[PDB]
Design a protein around this ligand. Structure first.
Ligand SMILES: NC(=O)c1ccc[n+]([C@@H]2O[C@H](COP(=O)([O-])OP(=O)(O)OC[C@H]3O[C@@H](n4cnc5c(N)ncnc54)[C@H](OP(=O)(O)O)[C@@H]3O)[C@@H](O)[C@H]2O)c1
Ligand SMILES: NC(=O)c1ccc[n+]([C@@H]2O[C@H](COP(=O)([O-])OP(=O)(O)OC[C@H]3O[C@@H](n4cnc5c(N)ncnc54)[C@H](OP(=O)(O)O)[C@@H]3O)[C@@H](O)[C@H]2O)c1
Lengths: 287, 287
C-alpha cells in the first residue's frame, strides 16, 4: 500500500504515526504549527508541507493528532474547503460530543470522518502491540483499514463518531486515577523514609495478574456481584484503614476519602454483602 | 523441614490457606476460629482443632493470627494473654502501622515476641513461590523463625519498626482500591453507551503492561519532575475532559473530580510545567 497520507500535528503521537506510515511505505506529508519537529521524519522521506492547505491537498487520507477540537478547527479552517472528497481521521476529540461536532463539520465540507483513539506509548506505534480503535461509518473504516494498519492493530467500534472518544476518555480516566493511587501510595510509604525506588517493585507486582479485569467485567455484564468471602463491607474497612493510616502519617487523604464515599454509597444501597464490582451501581447514578 | 508446631488463629480465607501451607510444609498445625465449621478440610489434612484459644496458643511456639483487624485480634487473644509469654506472635492482620505498634507493645507486655506481616496475594497464592509476605519487627525474631514462615511463600524483611509491614500493606491496598475504582468509573463511562464491560477490558489491560512506575519513582527520589512533552497543566486539561464527558454521559463525577482537585493543588503550588509526578509534592502536605 502506497496510498499517500498526511499527518497534521507533530506532538510525540503525531511523529510516531508519521514514522509508522513511512515505515509501511506510504508517501507521508507532515505539518505542524511549530516548525522544527519534522527533521527525523523528513530524513526518512516525509515531505514537510509549508501550509495546512498544501498538507491537506497532498493526500486522500488526513490524520489529525492535536490537542483538542478547538486546535483542530483553528488548524483546518483555512483549508476546510480542500477537505471535499477526502477522509479525515481525527485523534483529537476531547469528548464524545466534540467528536460528533467534528464529524458534522467535516460532513459540511464534503469529507468523510473517522474518530480515532489510541492509549499506548508513542514508541509502540507501528507495532502489532499498539491497539488503535475507530468509530464512524463502517464503510469509511473498511475502505482505509489497510492504510491505518500501518499504525498497529485496528478495532472498529461502531458508527457513532463519539465512541472512540468515549473509549479514550474512559482509558484516560483509568490511567490518571491509577497514577494518582500510585503517588498517594508512594507518599504513604515515603512518610517513613521508604524511597519510591524501593516501593515501586511491590507496586508493579500488584498489576501482574490483571485477573481482576476479566472477573470484574464478567460481573458487570451479568449484573451480579457475588460477594463470597471478600465482600464490599470488608473492602470498605480496608479503605477506612487507608484513611486512618494516611491521617496518622501526615499524608493528604482527599483521594482515599473519595474512594471511601463511593463504597459507602454502595453499602447504603444494600450491596454491603456483594463484591466491590457492585460499586458500579452507584457510579451510574450521579449523587 | 518442620516437625515445629504452628498455631493459626482465624480461619477466614487467608488463615485456611496459611494453615494448609503449614500442613503442606510438614508442621503440626493447631487451628482455632471464632466461628466453628470452617476447619473440616484442614482437620482431614491432619490439623488439630483447638477447643479454646488458650489451648491453641499453648500448642505451638509460633502463633500466626490472620483476622479482621487488631480489635478482633485483641478480642480473641484476651483469654490467652497468660499463655502468650515465651512465644512469638506473627500478626498478619494489623490494619494500620499505629495498630501494629500497639500490638507489638501489647505483646511485649505479655512476654511474647512479635512480628508484623503483610500479605500481598490472594489466598490461592499462599504456600507457593508466587506469595511474597513482607515482615517487620526484631531481626533476631524474624531470623529465628524464617524457616517456618517460608511455608507460606517468599519472605522479605523490611526493618525493625513493627509498623512497616502494615504501612506497605496499606499503601498497596491504597493503590489497589484506587485503581479498581478508576476501572469501574471507566467501565461505567463506556457502559453508558451500551458497550459491554467484557469488551472494554482488553483496552484497559493494555494500560497496564504499558511500565513507567519505576520512571516516576526515580523522579520522586530526585525531587525533580521534568515536564518534557506532557506537563501537569496538559494532564489537568485532559482530566477536565473526563469530568465533562462524565457529566454528559450522566455518570457520577466524584472520583475524577477528586483526581482533578489534586492536580489543581499542585498547579497552585507552581508545578503546572512539571510532570504529573510532581503532584506527590502536595500529597505529603495534608490539605
Ligand atoms: N486518541 C485520542 O482521542 C486522543 C485525544 C487527545 C490526546 N491524545 C493523546 O494525548 C497525548 C498528548 O496529547 P496532545 O496531542 O494534546 O499533546 P501534544 O503531545 O502536545 O500534541 C499536541 C499537538 O497539537 C498541536 N496544537 C495544539 N494546539 C494547537 C493550535 N492551536 N494550533 C495548532 N496546532 C496546535 C501541537 O502543535 P505545536 O507543536 O505547535 O505545539 C502538537 O502538535 C498523545 O499521546 C495523544 O495521542 C489522544
Ligand atoms: N485475600 C485476602 O482477603 C487477604 C489478602 C491479604 C491480607 N489479608 C488480611 O488477612 C486477614 C484475614 O483476611 P481473610 O481473607 O481471612 O478474611 P477476613 O474476613 O478479614 O477474616 C476475618 C477473620 O477474623 C475473624 N474475626 C473477625 N472478627 C472477630 C471477632 N470479633 N472475634 C473473633 N474472630 C473474629 C473471623 O472469624 P469468623 O470466621 O468467626 O468470622 C475470620 O477468621 C485480614 O487482616 C486481611 O486484611 C487478606
Amino acid at each position: 500500500n502506497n496510498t499517500p497520507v498526511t499527518v497534521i500535528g507533530l506532538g510525540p503521537m503525531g511523529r510516531a504515526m508519521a514514522g509508522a506510515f513511512l515505515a509501511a511505505g506510504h508517501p507521508t506529508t507532515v505539518w505542524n504549527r511549530t516548525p522544527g519537529k519534522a527533521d527525523a521524519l523528513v530524513a526518512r522521506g516525509a515531505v514537510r508541507a509549508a501550509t495546512v492547505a498544501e498538507a491537506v491537498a497532498a493526500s486522500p487520507l488526513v490524520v489529525v493528532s492535536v490537542t483538542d477540537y478547538d486546535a483542530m478547527r483553528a488548524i483546518l479552517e483555512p483549508a476546510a474547503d480542500a477537505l471535499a472528497g477526502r477522509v479525515l481521521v481525527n485523534l483529537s476529540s476531547d469528548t464524545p460530543e466534540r467528536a460528533r461536532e467534528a464529524a458534522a463539520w467535516a460532513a459540511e465540507h464534503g469529507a468523510d470522518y473517522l474518530d480515532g483513539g489510541v492509549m499506548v506509548p508513542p514508541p509502540m506505534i507501528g507495532t502489532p502491540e499498539a491497539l488503535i480503535f475507530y468509530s464512524g461509518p463502517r464503510e469509511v473504516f473498511e475502505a482505509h483499514r489497510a492504510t491505518l494498519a500501518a499504525l498497529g492493530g485496528s478495532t472498529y467500534l461502531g458508527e457513532d463518531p463519539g465512541l472512540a472518544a468515549l473509549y479514550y476518555v474512559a482509558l484516560l480516566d483509568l490511567f490518571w486515577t491509577t497514577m494518582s493511587g500510585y503517588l498517594h501510595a508512594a507518599a504513604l510509604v515515603g512518610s517513613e523514609g521508604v524511597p519510591a525506588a524501593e516501593f515501586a517493585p511491590f507496586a508493579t507486582a500488584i498489576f501482574d495478574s490483571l485477573s481482576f479485569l476479566e472477573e470484574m467485567a464478567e460481573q458487570i455484564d451479568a449484573g451480579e456481584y457475588p460477594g463470597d468471602e471478600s465482600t464490599l463491607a470488608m473492602n470498605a474497612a480496608g479503605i477506612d484503614h487507608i484513611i486512618h493510616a494516611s491521617r496518622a502519617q501526615g499524608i493528604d487523604t482527599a483521594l482515599p476519602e473519595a474512594v471511601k464515599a463511593l463504597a459507602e454509597r454502595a453499602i447504603a444501597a444494600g450491596h454491603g454483602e456483594d463484591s466491590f464490582t457492585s460499586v458500579i451501581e452507584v457510579l451510574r447514578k450521579p449523587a
